[model samples]
Target: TCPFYKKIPGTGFTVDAFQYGVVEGCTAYFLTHFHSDHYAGLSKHFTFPVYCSEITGNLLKNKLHVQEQYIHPLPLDTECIVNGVKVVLLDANHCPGAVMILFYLPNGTVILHTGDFRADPSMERSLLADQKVHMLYLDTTYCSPEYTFPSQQEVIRFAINTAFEAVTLNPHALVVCGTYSIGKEKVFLAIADVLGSKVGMSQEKYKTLQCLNIPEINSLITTDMCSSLVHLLPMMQINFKGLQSHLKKCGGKYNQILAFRPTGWTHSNKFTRIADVIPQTKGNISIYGIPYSEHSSYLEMKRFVQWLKPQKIIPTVNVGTWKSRSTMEKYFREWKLEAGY
Candidate 1:
């Protein structure tokens, strides 16, 4: 949730804003996840008491080199009074270290800041099940209509099964799975098990991934890129022009090319299983730009916002300049009224 406005309206704390310059009159800083968009503005020239989940602190110290004394790791579901405000961390289910923040003010107001999340329905049965949130700092990456896709559970299964289908048809096809710096490991790990191939990635990327508490991380990934036909490459390299040359070098070892570029950018109304391919294809090479999103859909957002009925919805993304913030306010108005709040 990368909102232009960094600080909460009244609090003396800043959420994800050291890199934004410590301009605000705040003493404490908080980070929700390790994604660059959220965690970008911080450096070692810090003296503030920053708070976040356990794994996020690991990334901050080991990967990013933020000093240890400043990092205050709060385990999920545990409550503590930080700088006089009751605070708790809830798992965001977006990335490994991602968490949804709960700030219970001294004045009896409750605020929820979902840094970036999938809003899995199961969270309704979570620690925040009953509380009436006064303010919801929403991850409005997919706030508008016409951006619906399948759930994370089904999306992962369909992506894995389709990789199998593609491999069965062409035994020599090199399976390339598109991924980010620290995400989409679950998708590729499942594929490694079913396809019986060691997932390949660079050594540097593998070191960063080790911080996550993934099951059996030692065997699932390999540093030798050419050793396995199923390789995990960054998202940008999944294109046909790029794939053509990458396969040309590795294609002699494996004859065909089948890549899975998992993202939500490709809009979908199916809201179910997807075994489709992107329109770009040439010769024996193909790309499946599956809508495997890590954020909540428009319908999911509507359900969450209306049901929770937060007093205020402070959108964190897409509220560019001054226009989209009010543009997004339209949904918040109707959704809250519809929910009878």
Candidate 2:
């Protein structure tokens, strides 16, 4: 089951291997992102050397609570081998530790596995300055052409403006914007950056941002920074600790918290999609609508294929009885045979 990749090693049914497993013959196991779905079994199952970008490795250790025993760090733009396969980590630009792995097989197969990506030119520039990839594994969470998103800056402005409006109306309020552990730290950092102050980022998120090379992000943002600003404004979080009361006390102003889930956060609830969570949080409390998502939309995916011009495309993250499968099937069908990595 480990090498077979049908599912977790022990699960009887074909569970789609949501968790990482120690592939028998493979020398290296490369991880692309740190989402629970993408990395659920990494700590428990992956006994062999698990390879990922430096930030991603730290994320596994810090955020996911994985031990450092099997962690292998792969620097961005540096090519290395895992399990005898030529591999490199590209700038996923999806999240702080997000990356796309390119695997070169002895069988003459070049594979590019995109964890969960957006249409950021950062990815393209990274690819151009980096390595040559043949087969592509894509992220097609939103494959319909009807799906589109505003720029990251625009989305952040919307979220901030919405938060400001909510606080203005509520007066005494604590707004909680739902974001992944470290990925959303940027939005908070941006808020703090524009305000020329700091935002309170959780311990895990703080480390995630540290691994990144961005100068401004590194210099100005911190949990303490946000804490300092608590007197002035409210804050948000992705997960709830049932500590809502404590957060309010920390803010010292209004206890109006706004929690929002972006498009990519995974939860096994009816309100799984951010669209579902937005309305419930939007009404009375401060609602910030940020079109920030980790995965690529249909057009973005299409454009990635167009830019890479790979011979075959593989949709890797969650496919086949999982998340990305439907997207891959639909894209392949729609494009006939043209949609390979």
Candidate 3:
């Protein structure tokens, strides 16, 4: 009953297998990305043929200990046949290893599954140049008009400058930036390059970065609080209570703590704009909410839909049940009406 999973009309393949577990008789499984929510029930002992990006395959094998025999890592843009259906992978632009899947069905229908991606012009142009997309499975994470945000590049610049400013203003303060395990690498790397500071990351995060092999990311496995001004913490750790406990353990060594959480949810209100820093200060701990997101906003999604012009738009977040199907119809009507589509 997961929204992420769907059965190919003619073919018997399944897209994602999280939340409600894998489909009963899926011919093959296609993973959009390695996000925990997307690949919820995956395990090393799993016995299905899983198709994903090369980087995702490596991460699953080394990190999750999934066997190589069951994993089929495919290169982007290359067409391959999966149970007789032509499949191609395109850059999702959401994360490092995320990809948008294009399925060329035997019935002459071209299905494009966005696979939780932010809009990328180059990728869009590439997709546009190809066959027309009949059915589009869209990621409607920020499907409301109130969720407008800036591009990842602009957000990255703001995040880097904010971190530097925070550290410069409070010289003895610990700058903790919150990020997903796989995303926001560009922000951390930019901070290191601009501030000349090495980021302290957990061993698991370091391993993930090592696999990326980008020289810009100068992160070291940190056990103790080091002298580095910038520290990379999981998104969950960038909270007031978390920082309070963390700084308390520092034993007065740090004069203050400045935490930045770069996400689009900050743009929920009428006042907050993209790249705007919304600060919340409590005692020596200050948390700044920066509008940075890898998901497309409502306007962005509308533009994408206009460009692609799919015959049918399938909502990825509401594929759970029949009742939700009617809900989706209402949502789509409101979305199009609001966007003047």
lDDT of 1 by residue, 1-66 (tens): 323456765578778775656555787889988888777767676777889988889888887888
- For lDDT, candidate 1 versus 3, the one ahead is 1
The lDDT values for all models are: 0.80, 0.57, 0.76
lDDT of 3 by residue, 56-89 (tens): 8988888888999999999988888888888999
**Colliding pairs, model 1:** 19-41
- How does candidate 1 fare on TM-score? 0.91
Task: Show model 1 residue runs off by greater than 4 Å.
Answer: 1-4, 267-279, 321-323
TM-scores for every predicted model:
0.91, 0.71, 0.87
Q: What is the lDDT of candidate 3?
A: 0.76
Candidates sorted on TM-score, descending: 1, 3, 2
Query: lDDT ranking from best to worst?
Result: 1, 3, 2
lDDT of 2 at 94: 80
